[PDB]
Amino acid sequence: DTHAIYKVENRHDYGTKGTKVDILTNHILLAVGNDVPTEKIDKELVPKLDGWWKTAFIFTYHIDFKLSKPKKYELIEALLDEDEILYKYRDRIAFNGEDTIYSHVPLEEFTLFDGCWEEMVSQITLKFSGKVGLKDIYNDTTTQDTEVQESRMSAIDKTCLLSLLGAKFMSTDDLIFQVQGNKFFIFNNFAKAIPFQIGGYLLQGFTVSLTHVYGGVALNTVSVPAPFIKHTKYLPGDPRFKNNEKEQFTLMDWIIECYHQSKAIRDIRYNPKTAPPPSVKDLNYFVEKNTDISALLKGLKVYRPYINRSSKGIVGFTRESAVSMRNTIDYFKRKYDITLKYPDMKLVNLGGKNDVVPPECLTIVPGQKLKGQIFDTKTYIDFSAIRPTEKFDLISRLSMPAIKRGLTDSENSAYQFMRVPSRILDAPVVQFKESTFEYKDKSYGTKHEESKGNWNMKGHQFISTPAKQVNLRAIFINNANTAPPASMESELDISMDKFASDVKQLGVDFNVSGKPILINQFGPPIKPTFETSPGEISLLNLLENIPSNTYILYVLRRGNDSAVYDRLKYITDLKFGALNSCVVWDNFKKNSIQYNSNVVMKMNLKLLGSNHSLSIENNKLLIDKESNLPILVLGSDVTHYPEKDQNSIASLVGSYDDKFTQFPGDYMLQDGPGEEIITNVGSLMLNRLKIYQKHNNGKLPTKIMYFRDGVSVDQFSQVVKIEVKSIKESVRKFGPQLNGGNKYDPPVTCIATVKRNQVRFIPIQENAKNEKGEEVAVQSMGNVMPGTVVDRGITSVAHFDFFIQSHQALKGTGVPCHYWCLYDENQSTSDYLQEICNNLCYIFGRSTTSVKVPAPVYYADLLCTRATCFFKAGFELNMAQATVSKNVLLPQVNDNIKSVMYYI
Template sequence: GRTLTYTVELKETEDLEVDLNSLRNYMKNKIYDKPMRALQCLEVVLAAPCHNTAIRAGRSFFKRSEPGKAFDLNDGYEALVGLYQTFVLGDRPFVNVDISHKSFPKAMPIIEYIEQYQRQKIDKSTNLDYRRYDIESFLKGMNIIYDPPACLASAPRVFRVNGLTKFPASSLKFELDGKQTTVADYFRSRKYNLMYPNLLCLHVGPPLKNIYLPIELCRIEDGQALNRKDGANQVAAMIKYAATSTNERKAKIIHLLEYFKHNLDPTISHFGIRLENDFIVVHTRTLNAPQVEYKNNNLASVRNGSWRMDRMQFFEPKPKPHKWAILHGKINYMSVVDFQGMIIQQSRTVNVCLNQKADIRNYRDERELDSHFQDFKKNQFDLVFVIIPNSGPFYDVVKQKAELQHGILTQCIKEITVLRKCNLQCIGNVLLKVNSKLNGINHKLKDDPRFLLKNAMFLGADVTHPSPDQREIPSVVGVAASHDPFGASYNMQYRLQRSALEEIEDMESITLEHFRVYHQFRKSYPEHIVYYRDGVSDGQFPKIKNEELRGISAACSKLRINPKICCVIVVKRHHTRFFPNGAPSQYNKFNNVDPGTVVDRTIVHPNEMQFFMVSHQSIQGTAKPTRYNVIENTGNLDIDLLQQLTYNLCHMFPRCNRAVSYPAPAYLAHLAAARGRVYLTGCTKFRTPKEEYAKRLIVPEFMKTNPM
């Protein structure tokens, strides 16, 4: 093999010396900016014992599984368990440790991958045209090891895969010594006959170079931490694998800490750092759950994070009868008729006003879908149920046509749900969505004299980013705002902006539009704005304060109003977990803390308004608390009242009868951003975000009558 010499130049971006005194200053004084550089320095030190024995991915170190003991996620992936570690600052410095789960491609010959997971038997006549897309999607961007035949007397080499070639090795030509030759003939001239000459080759190395390798001589490299989104099969298998009780999770963390032996590492010792053996004990408070109010002052009590709606009706459905229709594809007509009957039956129970009969129509393709939507719009239909295939992008197509082209309200439901899962409980859950889409109110919370926020708007925002391998796709902004007295009805705005930009660029115009809708419903402007901002990392807090809050203030100035503003950052991507004493029980099989548990001491900075809260009952696995950081509070809202208000808003998500893990405004903003992402489906070439957004404006009338 060749010997290569590289020259590596290291360039320091800031001063060579890191001032660790900044940590002490931050702990003593009320300094807004965290000393991120000093924290990063300590994290580098903390990682010292992990590099040689584990695979690094972000702040997590994954221990390689023993042969045959890895958890198979199917489709060529396996799950590894790792230790997450980072420094955090509470009333003293802490090391936050937790377990991480990540999928890794299995180290195996590519031929074996194709046979095992693509279910394609390989022989001399096999070509991969039929499986090309799936195989290429799996291998693209992955490192493979090329094992030259023994007759070439070359060492194995690692390459990155660009994709599959258009032609098989038997006909794929390249230039060698001024002559054209095929890949198969090249190896034959080197005394090696390819076993599978009809297979496509891998295009590897620099994309502009023509380096082609036969698949049969390549294998997948071990321990690759890929930055790609897992498929639906991997996600489902991973959730099942990772769902453990608090007791099991704690035991796994302790096992990994013992494996890495931080306190025996000379680098860590040199910096004078020593980790305690025990977890920190924190004091908790449990907030009282609110009572949920339905029509005629009927109240439902919340128990273990959920409540029952027995014989109760929605708080405020829209009174006029709604014209509605059902569109279906290949599903049996009588199944659709049965579905219609269950919708009518359950709508009477919960008091959603639908006409006694739906207009049932069949569609065969997208063109017919267009025609039906156009006719429904012309005849002023209020709602269309669309029964969609169980897989594929048809949901995205429906939403694009209905909301961007025609301005018609749709409720999608999968064929398998209509055929196999369609009971009254399922229909009840669907009608929760339908009533809120029709601008009705499913429930409110019983009035509490402590919360006298007159004319309050609850605002939520989120920005979703494309995966690292899709940077050409814009980021999507979703902002939801309440426009009723109860924080129950929301309208939404979405925008497109530069990929990976954290702060919302267009906050002023978004806020002005929300003010317009609020005034339309309330005949006044808000006196209080409680803004829950999701999807922000710690280092971005100053940007949110300087950019987004400035945009909200600019919108207020244009309308000459001066509402009190409270901005709360909602942080879900963290690794703090609570491990209560005791054992799992029949009603709490994962041994989680109770919904409403709050921690606002010890592990939070004493000079910041910050708290952790578990507002929901985890269905599986260890409950993840949400962390809340208050970065603006011009109305001086009391922290205890803000915690209770936040907990109450977790019970206001309109699509289920249970408390969710973070407040409804932020949750709905996430859904708004997800809908914006749906509008991008099918587009492969993107212009500027503003140009792309201009092509995808929601029909204005639809936005006015069906704001969420």
């Protein structure tokens, strides 16, 4: 007859439970929807902002080019900047930045594009693609149709308005950088910037996007960090900058810096403040054979200040000096009146024909991205780890000027952060073996708040631990070009013994009385033809002659060896299916009982144990009452591009008991690059069921929750229409062949989590009354108290969505997870869903904390991450040994561990 209809779920209620407090969010209300009756919101609370963005018709033009966005984008501003006629309209014309161009005015009124439908203008083709009324943005803001609201969220008018706001932001007399189309960095004396790695600084910018809320339209702003190449003597803030922002800083001045910096971090106690300045013989070898700066110069765009907005980039470094060039110093001394201070320095060339100039007089064009991998992660991370009070100021102080400039017509109580209501849910009860941890609310006075969703294992034991003493065997992977100190054998024997003794107190009996085994030269296959290295050769031997009941503890000499870790896991997990944990020597050797205690936590899980769970009452609400059979909780993630241009990897994990303590799973190569919809996710449902029925006397789950991670909004329709349908259709098929031939169609709810978003919260109060009148803390570490639930004011018009911030934000300003129930066959109220979401954040079994997203999702991410090591590990080989089959790129794991959390 007719196919069935997988429609995205409409919101049906709001939650009620929890301690109430208002909080602020980084949103501004632009407008109240047109379909909201004037007799609804006070005339004073409606934002006094009108303008073009409310009531305008925008010309749009499709536009082809002749490829890198760098060139196109650069191409457009060039026209917009090198023509005194168009320049006047440069706050009214915007790039998409590949397909279209938006303009407040028509482009056919320009004596420029005559024959596009002066020389550079020939790489563009214009085609008027209609007009866009911007005022329809403010239309269906009450409409309770999840399909309409979808088409509204990812709409042309929304993209137009956003992109035209960018135009306004960009038209200021201040120096301003556009990065990836929507991130703007302003480089004035008030900017937040620190020197970064080599020849670079970090800079705090901002970005805006607009989100539809119920009746109607909000603007969201958040700060963004980016690295750039240093183009100034001094960085903003420094008082030597306020005086001369334009104090001479040539290309040479930059290379010296990079020299000092490079050696000061590749050698220690180098100290540039003492170290003798390079006498130019060093400094020529450097700038040619040293990738720490060659890669940066390769392409670096420079200025020629001695010719009196055209930056020639570079090609490389010549061989001839500034003196041995016939003369150059004579040219510049006579014909430009300048004395070359480093005339022995090799010169650079800026392409043909013969346009060659010395670095000593060649300034660097601002705003250039600092290409490379971040290696100084600590600096990068600390730069952005700002607490909410400090971070909301920053957002306000970078955004508001630009936004005010944007929202006024091309010739202040409204610009303030939305205040929304929140509710703080109680933490569940954490269960250990014979003990509990329930946070009891208390006043903000002492630092008591900091313990909600943040305990430790002290005076506690794991719930379930291996029955038998098990054999723990050290293998010292010696991933270094030098043999380890003599005092390491003794140091490790010490460490192993203490480790075995500490974890006994948690309930884990290890027999550590083996003898540690050293493996030098371990590493990935190497050269087309590769042959296995030692001591992979050594290790392999070791692994196929491994005793029973043996847990491998890999002690890495140097941490951070991506290539080594991937292999150790590839060989031990995938090939051999042997239980193993890695540990980094310089940590392990400190012998912290806290370090050791966080390590067994993983090991225990791997040995099928259980560390902490929820209380007996808490678990009751993930149990179907109708069958006294727990719910099958699934998590799935998708990671993209494991290498170069390769197929994405999907994973699915699932619970199997009523304790929700263990989540094995399976992973799978997608059949395309950057494919986010797991089109055949149902095939992975087969093991979820088989191990479920194993731990439930042969019965199949009667309810199913599917937590789907990492989808954007445009994909919600397909998650429901393709993935949920696939799950449903699959269990309907696998069901019968598992329960004795009977009909199987359990109801599934599906909740997508988006844990990376642009929504932030700042607390307003230190305390708030609970329902008994007792004043009680509602913030911890200067962030909103975990878990503040927010489902009003900034949530969608029609979808069943809510924010919950489940974790203590130990650093910076925490990021709440945005949950959307996309599909629901078991009539779940918001109070129900919000509680199990928050609750599931307390049974992440490798940390003593509540985490920022339900355990199933974190587990699914970790599994995707591990599948990526397997992929990456055996890949160079699979490019040689060869398009390639799925199970040779990403093989299945050994059957031994198909039902363990080897990814933990």
